[PDB]
Symmetry: C2
Subunit: 402 residues, 2 copies
């Protein structure tokens, strides 16, 4: 007991951030605005993605509860004692800490920042059944309302600053892109290429920011059958001549995700594979033209489906054509509202940042067996969209003969 | 629709696994037993850690729903189209795939594998409120019971095979350790050290298995104020002579976590800092002796707390003395039932794998400012506990001069 349960130790000074004070305030005020309309007294964010969007700080889980409370006048994050003052140095607003000594210390903190609320917003899509039960025990008369979906929609529109940062990530995506290409050789293990590439981006990232946290940045370099799944982990498989390859760059900068995904081939490509590769590339080019303000997600997916249908490749499609960007990674975020999927009528609006990544996968034993995929990032504007991915795609440039 | 919604396509052949068929069957039958005694018809696992423990396969989230169903006769994993046949190649048992074409495709998948069930077990500590209502919308008269807690308790005990794998991780933790040490030097940026270390471990893992997926393995190398938080990310800060440093190794092998954490100093260490470091190491040696079968987690903590209370350092403790190992990582898992915290009365039994990692944090400006910590893993046996961490700890060895 004589041990501190909830105290605020602000160690060190606020760290650099790419986002301006106005940008961070804009976000926090967007919420207060939504609260005011839905009669909410305070909002309790708990996911990686929301806390990062609204505070600028990205937390490390390891089984502990984390959060951020926002009412009309304040904005506070709730980190654990294991994080010292890093969460305070990195978040826009205030920070408070709780310890492991008592099992309810976290709730004791949310309670302190929630004094008086009647209706509180929590993320219905991140809060578990257990967490909800413990929250009701901690906040007796509070009615919980969802803020998860509302944030998601508000996040689909990127500001110029977010836009600025994503543009910067795309650049690094190309730097990595160049490093993979240079590493490709018959005989080299996949993991060696990944190491070469990730190192390239980490160093590049470390160099372009006065201050920055090198985190989660990774590479997915797949060869042969490993290419049958877009998220397949790097393995120790040896790359062979002729193998179909998949270059995937994911540099994570201040929580924001950007990627570069390109199909490649070692030494040479066979007719069957070349055949499918070009057809997929053709769909890609068409996809890049369909991204425009006012277009419905499904319409885009329906039109592209046709081209595949002609070459009877439709049944080999692996996943949706594109998703929203911003604050997400492989283990958090992603605005489900914007998905280039057949039954999503969501309209594309200026400010959104979607991707075009057509992929088909052919089975083992089949000619051209493997996964084919190109991935570009487009910023939607008032009367068009800007493709910000520089790396070349297609047979004309990606048959690596090093 | 001329497009497949739920189909199973097993592209490739079952990959190698460190676990035997007996080991995996054991885990799946532990559930089947619990279900039988609690009258459950089927279990729907949905978390990273549970699907990995029971199927051996670690999925990639990226916003999609994943699962594994287990009734009395079958064991099937549910993966997305974007994953191709990788989920099948790594799953112990059957595998089914669903597509993005329709929003409920995943649900008709679980629906198919759950026919006739009245009581279904889900993970209440992982299922969101949103996920929960959708499951109720898809499985009408079905009653949901928690299976997360039951699994957590069953996983606290590690089999020999798991113990084997964990010993291999620890060995790799030591290689990372040597690599970090070799890279420490006034003038070098933190991330350069991190890269050297991670590269060393990834290469060492790729070399130890006929087949292995190189995933998530990472290093946290902290210097100066960045040592105030144990999970503080790598930054681009240049290391200076006399800086306190934290070496942290986390190799991820087939989803299993192991760790090596050691306090280090560059060139020299001041008297103030050497002072705190020696006492922390003292709390460490004592902690290693207190880990034995029969001990209650809370008793170990109360006993070590008294040591810190002697030197008036108790107020600087950052977090719990130790946790349980197994299928965990920074973004998933962790058996909450075994925490070396003040209010946890769990009795350590043979077969558990716990850590001993005392830490103290001194604020900026104070003498000795910084975060001090050591981390050893111990495999509890019938009559004692084996320390499998080999890298040295203490001032006698970690005042890096190079």
């Amino acid at each position: 007991a004589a041990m501190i349960x909830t105290x605020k130790y602000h160690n060190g000074x606020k760290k650099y951030t790419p986002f301006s004070x106005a940008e961070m305030t804009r976000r926090x005020x967007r919420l207060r605005a939504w609260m005011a309309k839905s009669x909410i007294d305070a909002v309790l964010f708990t996911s990686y993605h929301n806390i990062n969007y609204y505070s600028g700080w990205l937390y490390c889980y390891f089984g502990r509860k984390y959060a951020x409370v926002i009412x009309x006048v304040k904005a506070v994050t709730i980190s654990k004692g294991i994080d010292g003052g890093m969460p305070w140095r990195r978040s826009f607003g205030x920070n408070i800490v709780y310890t492991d000594w008592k099992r309810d210390n976290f709730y004791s903190a949310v309670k302190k920042l929630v004094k008086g609320a009647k209706x509180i917003g929590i993320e219905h899509d991140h809060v578990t059944l257990x967490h909800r039960r413990x929250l009701x025990k901690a906040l007796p008369g509070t009615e919980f309302v969802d803020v998860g979906x509302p944030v998601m929609w508000x996040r689909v529109i990127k500001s110029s600053e977010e836009x600025x940062l994503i543009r910067x990530g795309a650049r690094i995506s190309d730097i990595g892109g160049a490093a993979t290409a240079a590493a490709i050789s018959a005989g080299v293990p996949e993991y060696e290429v990944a190491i070469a590439t990730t190192x390239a981006m980490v160093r590049x990232i470390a160099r372009x920011f006065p201050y920055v946290e090198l985190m989660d940045t990774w590479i997915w370099f797949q060869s042969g059958i490993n290419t049958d799944g877009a998220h397949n982990p790097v393995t120790x498989r040896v790359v062979x001549r002729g193998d179909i390859l998949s270059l995937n760059c994911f540099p994570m900068i201040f929580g924001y995700y950007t990627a570069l995904e390109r199909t490649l081939f070692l030494x040479x490509v066979x007719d069957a594979s070349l055949x499918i590769w070009x057809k997929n590339t053709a769909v890609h080019r068409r996809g890049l033209x369909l991204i425009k303000p006012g277009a419905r997600c499904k319409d885009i997916a329906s039109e592209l489906n046709x081209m595949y249908r002609x070459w009877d490749l439709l049944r080999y499609r692996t996943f949706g054509y594109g998703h929203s960007f911003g604050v997400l990674x492989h283990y958090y975020g992603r605005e489900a509202g914007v998905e280039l999927r057949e039954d999503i009528x969501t309209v594309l609006e200026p400010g959104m940042v979607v991707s075009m990544e057509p992929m088909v996968m052919x089975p083992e034993g089949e000619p051209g067996a493997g996964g084919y995929r190109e991935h570009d990032i487009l910023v939607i504007k008032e009367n068009x969209t800007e493709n910000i991915t520089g790396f070349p795609f297609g047979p004309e440039h990606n048959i690596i003969k090093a």
